[PDB]
Structure 1
Amino acid sequence: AAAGVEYPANRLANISELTLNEPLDVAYPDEDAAGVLLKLGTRVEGGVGPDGDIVGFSTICPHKGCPLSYSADNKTFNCPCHFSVFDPEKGGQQVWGQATQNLPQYVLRVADNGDIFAEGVDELIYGRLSNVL
């Protein structure tokens, strides 16, 4: 009956679990949709926490669904299949690549105890025709 997708508000981690510039594996909006939380050390688009620097992304390439690797030196996600590069410091913008989407980014919220919740996604996740299956 509902006009929009109903996203669940799922706890992913606590801010205390994150180290600067090291992705933490998560899954949202369900266990079959891999992604990461990443603390970048600088305030950025979609970034939450005291420093506005914590972001969440799908890490499945929106072109053909290959898992992305993170380059800590460049702070980029990188696709070994067809050479795509995504910039988590700029909303997941595809720097160069084959996808017609920038990287699906989580709408995050930090509770008073430091718990990080995801409550939406801003693009269609690879391999599902509805973000909430």
Structure 2
Amino acid sequence: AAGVEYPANRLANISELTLNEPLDVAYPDEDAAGVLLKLGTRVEGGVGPDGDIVGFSTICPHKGAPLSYSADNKTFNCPGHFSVFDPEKGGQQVWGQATQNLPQYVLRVADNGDIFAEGVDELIYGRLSNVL
């Protein structure tokens, strides 16, 4: 098969998300930490009725330190080497050491409000294939 076969995994329900508080998930398997985040304004890769729910890897694509979230600024921040990623702009590295903007999940909301992930737009730290 010419491309990676992503599984369509249920991550959570829209009802579980509180505005601006990340919810720890994992995709495309259990060893690849990420978060779903409702942002309160329509954004790139955002789903749900307000267009504002995004999913990212929270593992720094530079050297793999886990990223912290600043609620005041709405950014991911790396304590490794000071990188900053903006989940309001597709994960754009505002300033940092990675050669990649933050890997972002392709999300879909079903009619019951369940949130699925069916892909990732960049290579997840620590794996040479996003699906191992």
Measured against the shorter chain, the TM-score band is over 0.9
Query: Post-superposition shift, 1:132?
Result: 0.1
RMSD value, Cα: 0.1
Unpaired segments ≥5 residues, structure 2: none
CA-CA distance at 1:113 after TM superposition: 0.0
TM-score (norm 1): 0.99
1:6 counterpart SS class: coil
Using the TM superposition, give the Cα deviation of residue 89 of structure 1 relative to its aligned residue in structure 2, in angstroms.
0.1
How far the C-alpha of 1:88 sits from its partner, in A, is 0.0
In 2, the alpha carbon distance for the partners of 1:29 and 1:112 equals 22
Unaligned runs of 5+ in 1: none
**Paired position in structure 2 for 1:60:** 59
CA distance in 2, matches of 1:81, 1:16: 33
For residues 123 and 39 of structure 2, the distance between their equivalents in structure 1, rounded to whole angstroms, comes to 24
Distance in 2, Cα, partners of 1:52 & 1:130? 29
* Deviation by residue 1:26-67 (Cα, 9 ceiling, x = unmatched): 000000000000000000000000000000000000000000
Give the number of equivalent residue pairs.
Answer: 132
1:93 Cα offset (Å): 0.1
| Secondary structure in 1 matching 2:88 | helix
Cα distance in 1 for partners of 2:128, 2:89 equals 25
Hey, what's the Cα distance between the residues in 2 that align with 1:24 and 1:80? 20
Once superposed, which parts of structure 1, at least 4 consecutive aligned residues long, lie more than 6 Å away? none
